[PDB]
Subunit: 230 residues, 4 copies
């Protein structure tokens, strides 16, 4: 029926000047714009959107919330969870995607997150660049919120809720924004790729995408990016 | 604990050039601004906001969604219903709050909505300025969506869900934006006034307000408008 | 589609030896039996049952829970509310439907609950035969739980949730047991009768009934009692 | 706070005369009894029970539903999922825990389900002793419902929902019946054992048990079986 796969913008942290994280720190102008653009895209092009889901974060939300205002809806239930986020970086943060790179350089910078057995180093509870129990988060076995996090285990964050909650209604129209890897995650498991695949398709923020599927959610009709030339 | 009573902005229909309605048609710039302002208000001043509710409409939402982005949250469950809207006008629409006034003038213009036994004339299903079953709406006994609507019966829209759903969690922090009359409605029943009262306190959009209450939701600590001088 | 209208059994309080109430005190053997019978009825006859609702009470539940076990289901979501109960008696209780009758006798005994402007006398919080905040109940504006209660206002208990929650899914199969008056209530508003009507059709517990309806929930196909000769 | 860990009865299939399965086929008399007993146990002994969960199955439910009626509640929300069942047998069924045993005998009979890399053989969709999409089940990525199933992967059925949904409220009292392995599953991951452990503690149906925990759900106060001598 409908899979609306949207990758936010570029936040305003890491991006711009290298850093960012699972941290949750809004996003610049491109967001609103690109997002509004995407919002512009689903509607204007065609289709509308029945149900929406967000990795309990402001960043992504901005993207999602905006699209809706312009298409001409805004009105609808919405569902917020913690199974839809950017792969927790490791023990880095700030960095600048330079000194880090400058330091170790190599596949290390590239590989770290990527495949497995080596996500970014963990993360202690004595670095403002973590993410623990900001209210919210503590309505979940505290024995959860990760530590390093990869798009692998990430598969699970995606997996349970996917079949469970959304997979439930999807007998209709629903949209789960997320971005960076989640969406990769959604498709990655979804399509073919193969754990070694994906690793090579960041995915265009702003714009928006649909899978189509049917009953047993295997993608019949391919994938449309509204702006294939985006 | 917390009652966050927020009256949107001024849409961009009626307002500006007289008209508007239960119709659902976004809002101008003041909205984003005033709203962002309010959003600015809850947070900046103090407090934060646990749970949010909207009369399944884009207008109000804009106001609500914005405040959240600036305070610095955006992240949280949110609940959308159809028991939180602007008192359906009657059989007017467009008007211009002039010819209508110009035409009948008198308490008629003033009184129509106001008290009772005379809401605006009903409304047929052959005027683009109605509101029937835009998707959504038809997940409700169709034998519902009003026709004229006053802030009286409106009391009920407010009443059932109020005690039922929100009244449920309010053992914590929650915010239900709405505006125009709903909020009047929330307080009107809530405080003293007396059906003949309220009728004289439109309430400042943008800004935001808290009741305080306790257990049996009777307003102990009075009401704060963040900007008493707003 | 489906309205399954079931009136419990006869509890084991009032019934048997005159008394009973909104109190919530299980039910005798006929319940299990009659209920199982009804349970027997929906299934055996035909149909099955998608969704179930109960006036947060053990009495009715017994009836509902049983039917399900025998038809051969038991498995399914279920929804419990406080908008589905027996019209709170007044200030009587125990009584015995004799001394009370013996005392005032007249339409008083008969009329009390019945129509209006005279439900049973209220009820204070110093008679074990009330019902206040047994856990549960206090997840509702405390400024609720009635006091006397009639099948009139009762209409409202029925009304909000009816259109709101169930009325939502009923685009499928759902069953809301209740009994005594609720069901009267469900039909009473539903059909014709006329406030002065109903008052003359207690309705067979045990057995079970279906309305049929369609879209705008007006009863197309009449009403089947599985056992018309019950 | 409260973990109520209850292992049904003994159904009435496999048990009695060897067979049974993930199939879902009620239970004999001991159930009602033992269950009622357990129901008897939580209440009578002490405590009460705030929230209840069932592996969308009649068998277990019978057990759960009964306890409640006798303790003296029955009234409360209840939550039904498909993440709480008996480890799907494999490709056997009926059997009789004799010919099967008689046939292969050995750890094969004993080991099959047990640890891993050898659950019971799968199961095709041409044996009435499977379990596919009995209504219900098809509100889940169809690409789910297992095939063989072990108490290992089973860990996951337990895992997602556990932290997600219940783990949510457990800041209070809740009970998730299930049985056979689920409960093993609940504790198995929960305590120490070690994949090779559990394998040696079937757990007493009927009766009921509590863990206690706290915040980060690690079992402070040990485990009480109401009837240690049961």
């Amino acid at each position: 029926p409908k899979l609306v796969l949207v990758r936010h913008g570029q936040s305003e942290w890491n991006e711009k000047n290298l850093f960012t994280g699972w941290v949750d720190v809004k996003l610049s102008a491109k967001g609103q714009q690109e997002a509004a653009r995407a919002g512009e895209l689903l509607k204007e092009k065609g289709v509308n959107v029945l149900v929406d889901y967000t990795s309990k974060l402001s960043r992504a939300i901005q993207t999602a919330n905006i699209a809706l205002e312009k298409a001409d809806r805004l009105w609808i239930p919405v569902n917020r969870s913690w199974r839809l986020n950017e792969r927790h970086y490791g023990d880095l943060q700030g960095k600048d995607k330079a000194q880090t790179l400058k330091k170790f350089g190599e596949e290390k910078f590239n590989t770290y997150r990527r495949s497995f057995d080596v996500p970014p180093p963990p993360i202690d509870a004595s670095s403002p660049f973590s993410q623990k129990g900001d209210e919210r988060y503590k309505y979940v076995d505290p024995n959860v919120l990760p530590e390093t996090e990869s798009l692998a285990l990430v598969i699970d964050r995606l997996l349970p809720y996917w079949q469970d909650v959304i997979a439930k209604l999807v007998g209709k129209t629903s949209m789960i924004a997320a971005h960076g890897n989640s969406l990769r995650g959604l498709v990655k498991h979804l399509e073919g790729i193969s754990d070694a695949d994906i690793a090579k398709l960041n995915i265009p923020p702003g714009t928006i995408l649909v899978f189509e599927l049917d009953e047993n959610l295997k993608p019949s009709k391919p994938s449309y990016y509204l702006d294939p030339e985006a």
